[PDB]
């Protein structure tokens, strides 16, 4: 319908939101495949990204996709997809599915002292 403005300053209108979300979701899944399968981050992120990709594939209309993606404007859904992609590319390098690097001391989180 060519929404005139997103309402948020600095967040421009996306002309083709559906194909953009599909490309970002498949790129998230392609990056996320390099994480081991036992990691909970991969399981949870694949689950929510498959839900979002099926909702994007299931709706031609932009505003109905905004009401059932449940994330506000469609452009901030795209922005969140970009943030999730950058996050997953950092999670590959950090490897945080590893065991705890160091136990805290014996009364480290004891409150009150």
């Amino acid at each position: 319908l060519l929404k005139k403005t997103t309402g948020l300053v600095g967040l421009a209108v996306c002309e083709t939101p559906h194909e953009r979300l599909k490309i970002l979701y498949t790129k998230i899944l392609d990056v996320l495949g390099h994480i081991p399968k036992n990691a909970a981050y991969r399981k949870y992120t694949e689950q929510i990204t498959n839900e979002k990709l099926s909702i994007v594939k299931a709706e031609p209309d932009v505003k109905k996709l905004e009401e059932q993606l449940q994330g506000g404007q469609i452009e901030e859904v795209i922005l969140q997809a970009e943030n999730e992609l950058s996050l997953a590319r950092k999670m590959i390098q950090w490897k945080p599915w590893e065991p705890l690097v160091e136990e805290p001391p014996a009364s480290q989180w004891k409150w009150p002292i």
Binding site: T5, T6, G7, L8, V9, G10, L11, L79, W111, P112
Partner: protein, 360 residues
């Protein structure tokens, strides 16, 4: 003419407030909060009161909650008069300063009628409010509110459509939405940039879910939309004050737990338990169960938060005070890039900066 870098040096009013709080009890550390945002006194009282009442696992009575919302919106009128009139006085519009400080003077008379001080009331306390509204106060609040929209109208007649006020504020200090969220902005600084966020709607406190009001949202992120947001928040504060005057319930004003709030002075001079409780609350103070809260309210400058840590004693172990002006004056350097030197006074004006809460 341009500004390449702005380095604000602060601490010129650092008094070490939140170290002094550590050596005083909760009632004794309450009047430190009147002096942080010293144009928003009862709102900071309300934020500290809600922090302590969250840690105490008690709640105010309904009439105290309506008094806190009524005086929080009177406080919001005070603060946005201060904001708009000093932001206009620094640019050069010096006349609505004098026009609106008579209205601000009458609201300080409201504070003095209800507490005895004009600014630092120590009126909103953990447990409720200190004292009940004297007779004829709400009638005069109604007589103020009946006239105050015309004062806002003639303010808005002097500034809003003026081309000189627009030229000093329309292209000035544009904040994007993502950089407003990333710099920790809050209140009008978010809402001028399009971000639909208000703590009285989303994470509501005392009876703000029972008042009906609107949230002004800007569209360009500049000084002018933040000006229009503050003026419309004065409008909506008049709306909430009308709803508070019409829906004020009868009843008590302190919590009826006399191990938290002190008893009435007639029964302290009659009952043994009331005299013991009066003694122990005004000398030791109530003990607070151990824990760390971060209770944030929507002060008229933004999210005012208290990270209060209680060790189980009658004094705070730690009390970190989050001010909106701290993050706003941190973001001053990005908000002033590419602007002129006379734009910087407009940008320091449009961030409603009060250095008591900036410095503590």
């Amino acid at each position: 003419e341009m500004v390449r870098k702005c380095d604000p040096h602060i601490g010129l009013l650092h008094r070490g407030t939140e170290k002094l709080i550590e050596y005083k009890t909760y009632l004794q550390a309450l009047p430190y909060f009147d002096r942080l945002d010293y144009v928003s006194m009862m709102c900071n009282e309300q934020a500290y009161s809600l922090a302590v009442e969250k840690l105490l696992n008690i709640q105010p009575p309904p009439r105290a909650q309506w008094i806190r919302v009524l005086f929080g919106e009177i406080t919001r009128l005070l603060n946005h008069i201060m904001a708009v009139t000093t932001h206009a006085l620094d640019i050069g519009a010096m006349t609505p300063f004098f026009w609106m400080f008579e209205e601000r003077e009458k609201m300080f008379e409201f504070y003095e009628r209800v507490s005895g001080a004009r600014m630092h009331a120590a009126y909103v306390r953990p447990g409720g409010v200190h004292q009940d509204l004297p007779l004829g106060l709400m009638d005069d609040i109604y007589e103020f509110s009946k006239n105050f929209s015309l004062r806002i109208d003639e303010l808005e007649e002097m500034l809003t459509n003026n081309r000189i006020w627009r030229n000093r504020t329309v292209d000035i200090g544009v904040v994007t939405a993502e950089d407003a969220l990333n710099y920790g902005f809050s209140g009008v600084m978010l809402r001028g940039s399009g971000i639909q966020w208000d703590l009285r709607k989303t994470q509501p406190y005392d009876v703000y879910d029972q008042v009906e009001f609107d949230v002004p949202i800007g569209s360009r992120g500049d000084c002018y939309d933040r000006y229009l947001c503050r003026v419309e928040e004065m409008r909506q504060s008049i709306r909430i004050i009308s709803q508070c005057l019409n829906k004020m319930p009868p009843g008590e004003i302190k919590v009826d737990d006399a191990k938290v709030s002190p008893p009435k002075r007639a029964e302290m001079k009659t009952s043994m338990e009331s005299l013991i409780h009066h003694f122990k609350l005004y000398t030791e103070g109530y003990q607070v169960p151990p824990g760390a809260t971060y209770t944030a309210i929507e002060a008229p400058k933004g999210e005012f938060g208290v990270y209060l840590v209680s060790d189980g004693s009658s004094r705070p172990y730690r009390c970190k005070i989050k001010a909106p002006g701290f993050a706003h004056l941190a973001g001053l350097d990005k908000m002033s890039k590419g602007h002129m030197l006379a734009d910087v006074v407009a940008i320091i004006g449009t961030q409603d900066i009060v250095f008591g809460e900036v410095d503590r």
